[PDB]
Design a protein around this ligand. Structure first.
Ligand code: K
Ligand code: MG
Ligand code: MG
Ligand code: MG
Ligand code: MG
Ligand code: MG
Ligand code: MG
Ligand code: MG
Ligand code: MG
Ligand code: MG
Ligand code: MG
Lengths: 173, 402, 65
RNA sequence: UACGUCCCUCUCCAAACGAGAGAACAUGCAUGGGCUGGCAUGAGCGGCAUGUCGGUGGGGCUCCGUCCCGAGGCGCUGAACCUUGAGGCCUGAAAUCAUGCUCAGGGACAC
RNA sequence: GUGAGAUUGUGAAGGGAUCUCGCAGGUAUCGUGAGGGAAGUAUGGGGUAGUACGAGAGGAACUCCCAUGCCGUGCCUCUAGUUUCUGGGGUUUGUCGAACGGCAAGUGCCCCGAAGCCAUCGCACGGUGGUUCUCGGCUGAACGCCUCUAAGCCAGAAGCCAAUCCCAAGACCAGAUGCCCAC
RNA sequence: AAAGAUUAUCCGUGCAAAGCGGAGCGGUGGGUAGUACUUGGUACGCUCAUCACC
RNA sequence: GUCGCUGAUCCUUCGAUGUCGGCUCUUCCUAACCUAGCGCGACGCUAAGGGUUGGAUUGUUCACC
RNA sequence: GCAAAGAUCUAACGGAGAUAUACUCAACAUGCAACGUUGGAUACUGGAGCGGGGAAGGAUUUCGUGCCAACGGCACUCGUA
């Protein structure tokens, strides 16, 4: 329901009733799997491999993955990230004379969705990297440094030259 | 003037109009005739299509040049998790057709069943069936259930159960839907009282496919074909292309009618929708009803091929993934793409011919990769061909320094 | 059925895969040759020697071990 | 009034545009790892540096030997690169998937 | 009665009369099936059997099996076709001092090439009953003989009707059911 | 489509004859121990806990 | 013998109804060629449900191989 | 319908041409689209040239500063207006 209809405090209460009640308890009640498994003939009917949260490199049965992630205060205005963008899957079978301009638009949209900005400014180094093999020869991957700033928010996006793209993940710097 | 030369018309006029189907699921338009002598039983089940493959078998057919010889046959794999029964309905005959008498609901329902009544379930109040749930257990609700069951006993002639799928048990990542599919399944056999007793016994419980179908019988399939959007006359109806030098285009019907009647008739071919139509397909033989991999890992091992392997090919079913529940293997093809839900039905046609009565024994089931030209049946076979590779050498030299 | 080896590469050919070919100048002991891939058949037509193609069993056996 | 529905946003079994199937803090999305497959042995070095063994070249320069020019060849090397995108698989059989981002979703009707 | 308006042609404020419509449904599933459409059709072989019939020569047929032609509805495991995944490799002329990386020749050109699409060039499937015509009969008179007919019954065609199959409530379904509001 | 002080108790029965019948035990959350089901998610025995109908 | 089911006219159109044949595509008729049943090797009755081809020469329709 | 002559991208500066909001609301989901100049990048013409000069024909279209009503079949802060 709408947060301008209900007070902010009222909106908090509805979220709490679902979060700690009828979701958290179900978890604590279904804990009873330990009680059943300890009584179950050892080996014997042990064909219960997955149940009970006793298995290598598996998920937490009973709760979602999103409900376990750590929540933190909203990030500050000024923040810097480093990321890889896979442009090859975005530009597949596109008309050859439009590949570099479309790459510019796609990069802007990617960063804009990530950073909640409408004003995304492309640095000269990134523009040169995207165009440096002609209009049809756009590289398959690119690594970008994204800096958000406030005057109204906007981003500056620039190129990070790398030797190989293997093993790199999104980082906050 | 009569046409100089004659040929049969293009297309079947009994499949008109070629419009999009009203729903995406396959629904049986009729059920096999009820024979009151038999024991009460269910007549359909819902399954999900996951790719196809091929098998080898010996043929038992006197008089055929293929007698006692090995043949290769393509098959389709359909995943079949158990269904859950949530309600009972009854119908009475009238001079204008069948009418629903009432519905008996189960005392508890699943969240997946209740999700089917909303468009945004997560951001809602989630109050479906709450009043019915609390009212059905008081003194008056019990009386009302007794009343409606007696009305079924007195006036009904057809009994059906309401059943739904279990997507949480399906555990597939490309089937995005989370609200259950719901359908009526008719109960055939016995008398009305016996039907009611069976339907009341299996209320709030789940039903497996192997309790509806047996291995070597046949079935009918109800499903919706793949869509292709707006299609031209050459593909939609199979008319001939015109010569190269034709002005204004070649992929057309040249004459769409005579001077009289001064009209275009419903029998002439025109451009329009092709695909996404409902179809009922007749005699599909069941080759295997397979147990869940968690229960029995050697799904695709036969008596003649002792290799241990599952029904999932190397690299997975393209666009679908792993098969993790019970499954059925049908001979041949079925309408519709991968991931679509379809209905299996008990057969209508006579099942007395030799081909329908034959007993099937599999000798080889293919599990090579469907990406590319697969040439290995197992990962162990691939690892026997290639020895250790550079990646393995690095792994075994950096996992030993510790 | 039985698994057959490809004429050019000795890849294993399982039931329901591949293509079989019979030449006019047929050998009495091998009238029919089995090919696992169009690439293998094309190389055999071009008359290459399998011992120089690095992904064949012949090459692997004479070089790697 | 309330239950709710639609738009914006995300996905593709649908699709000219409408319409459809779905999701709505969800392994949802992103990047990486592993698989599955494609091609056919990368750039650089050196023939003495590769896996107790095995180590070029028709010819030609220079001051005996030694040091150089040279297409191609051999070793490191089934290497290197590519692999979901109009939209392949694995985080739930076994023996093997990891991180990062979401921080009161917004608007219109229902009235 | 209860709310909202307007009363529409010469200024700015006040209060009277009439007019108009708002005063109960909304949203989400499962079904029925009137009416309309409508489809399967040919050829060969086996054995029946060298049997019946025949002086001999010669020489059948139904139940039931096995295939194939055409037509129809789908499908993509395999085989085949297709590549702007410009995927990997190779190769010509020009060009950034060279190598590396590439780039221009509206996709330079050659080989192999996944996914998708697709072929009587591949693979799967194609149902049951009622009546009644030509005709064959039964009981039976007129016309006590007779007669398949005048009454009345029985068998019977790739015909017609229904079902299975496709669309389906302007066919306005007090068919069933989940939730909220109104009474 | 249902049948009744003019449609103003409930089942049973044939628009009968008779026969019943009218704190409790429901929806929710807390402990507590076993079971069933495809095995993470629902039911079920006790036990308080707030709302309930009658 | 008997009894039935190309021409000739000039009514419409000269402030214009595009003139042969083939190709493509649908539909209807029976005066039945095949397929289906009967009665008498041929002849007759019912039956329009399904089908009725590839080529050489000729602009040909026809005709002929 | 405005589809032959392959094609633009990026930052800063300029301009009324914006970052233009009622409650509530950190920012996305409520001001879009488009322009001149300079720098950088990427391509095209390819000496029978969208190079540099003349005849016929035209007659101020030439140069600078302003301006943007009409005209430059979209646009303009620009123009053979
Ligand atoms: K237009
Ligand atoms: Mg599609
Ligand atoms: Mg022409
Ligand atoms: Mg494949
Ligand atoms: Mg009908
Ligand atoms: Mg150039
Ligand atoms: Mg190029
Ligand atoms: Mg245009
Ligand atoms: Mg153009
Ligand atoms: Mg040029
Ligand atoms: Mg203009």
């Amino acid at each position: 329901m709408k947060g301008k209809v209900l007070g902010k405090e009222k909106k908090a209460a509805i979220i709490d009733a679902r979060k700690k009640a009828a979701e958290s308890r179900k978890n604590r009640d279904d804990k009873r799997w330990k009680r059943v498994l300890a009584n179950m003939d050892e080996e014997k009917r042990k064909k219960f491999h997955g149940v009970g949260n006793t298995a290598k490199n598996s998920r937490v049965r009973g709760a979602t993955r999103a409900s376990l992630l750590k929540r933190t205060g909203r990030k500050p205005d000024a923040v810097s990230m480093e990321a890889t963008i896979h442009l090859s899957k975005l530009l597949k079978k596109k008309t050859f004379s439009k590949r570099a301009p479309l790459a510019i638009k796609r990069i802007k949209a990617f960063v804009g969705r990530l950073m909640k900005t409408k004003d995304n400014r492309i640095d000269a180094s990134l523009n040169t990297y995207i165009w440096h093999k002609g209009v049809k020869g756009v590289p398959g991957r690119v690594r970008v440094l994204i800096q958000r700033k406030s005057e109204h928010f906007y981003t500056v996006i620039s190129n990070v030259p790398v030797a190989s793209f293997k093993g790199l993940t999104t980082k906050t710097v | 003037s009569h046409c100089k030369f004659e040929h049969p018309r293009h297309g079947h006029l009994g499949f008109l109009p070629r419009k999009r189907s009203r729903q995406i699921r396959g629904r049986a338009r009729a059920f096999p005739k009820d024979d009151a002598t038999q024991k009460p039983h269910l007549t359909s089940f819902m399954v999900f299509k996951a790719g196809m493959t091929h098998i080898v078998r010996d043929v038992d057919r006197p008089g055929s040049k293929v007698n006692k010889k090995e043949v290769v046959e393509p098959v389709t794999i359909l995943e079949a998790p158990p269904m859950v029964i949530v309600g009972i309905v009854g119908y009475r005959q009238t001079p204008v057709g069948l009418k629903t008498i009432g519905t008996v609901w189960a005392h508890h329902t699943s969240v997946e069943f209740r999700r089917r009544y909303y468009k945004n379930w997560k951001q809602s109040a989630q109050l479906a069936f709450s009043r019915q749930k609390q009212f059905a257990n008081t003194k008056e609700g019990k009386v009302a259930e007794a009343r409606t069951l007696n009305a079924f006993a007195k006036k009904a002639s057809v009994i059906r159960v309401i059943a739904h799928t279990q997507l949480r048990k399906l555990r597939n990542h490309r089937v995005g839907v989370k609200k259950a599919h719901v359908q009526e399944i008719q109960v055939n056999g016995g008398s009305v009282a016996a039907k009611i007793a069976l339907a009341k016994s299996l209320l709030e419980k789940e039903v497996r496919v192997d309790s509806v179908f047996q291995q070597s019988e046949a079935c009918d399939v109800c499903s919706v074909t793949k869509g292709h959007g707006t299609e031209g006359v050459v593909k939609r109806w199979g008319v001939a292309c015109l010569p190269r030098k034709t002005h204004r285009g070649l992929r057309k019907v040249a004459c769409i009618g005579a001077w009289h009647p001064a009209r275009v008739m419903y029998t002439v071919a025109r451009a329009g929708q092709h695909g996404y139509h409902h179809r009922t397909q007749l005699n599909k033989k069941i080759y295997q009803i397979g147990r869940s991999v968690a229960v029995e890992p050697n799904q695709a091992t036969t008596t003649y091929d002792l290799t241990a392997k599952t029904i999932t090919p190397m690299g997975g079913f393209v666009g679908y993934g792993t098969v993790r529940n019970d499954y059925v293997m049908l001979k041949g093809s079925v309408s519709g793409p991968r991931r679509r839900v379809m209905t299996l039905r008990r057969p209508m046609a006579p099942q007395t011919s030799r081909q329908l009565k034959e007993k099937i024994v599999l000798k080889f089931i293919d599990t090579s990769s469907k990406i590319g030209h697969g040439r290995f049946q197992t990962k162990k076979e691939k690892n026997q061909w290639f020895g250790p590779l550079k990646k393995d050498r690095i792994r075994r030299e950096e996992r030993l320094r510790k | 059925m039985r698994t057959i080896e490809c004429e050019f590469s000795h890849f294993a050919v399982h039931p329901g895969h591949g293509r079989r070919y019979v030449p006019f100048a047929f050998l009495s002991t091998k009238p029919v040759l089995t090919f696992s891939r169009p690439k293998c058949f094309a190389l055999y037509m071009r008359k290459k020697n399998p011992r120089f193609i690095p992904w064949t069993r012949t090459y692997r056996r004479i070089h790697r071990k």
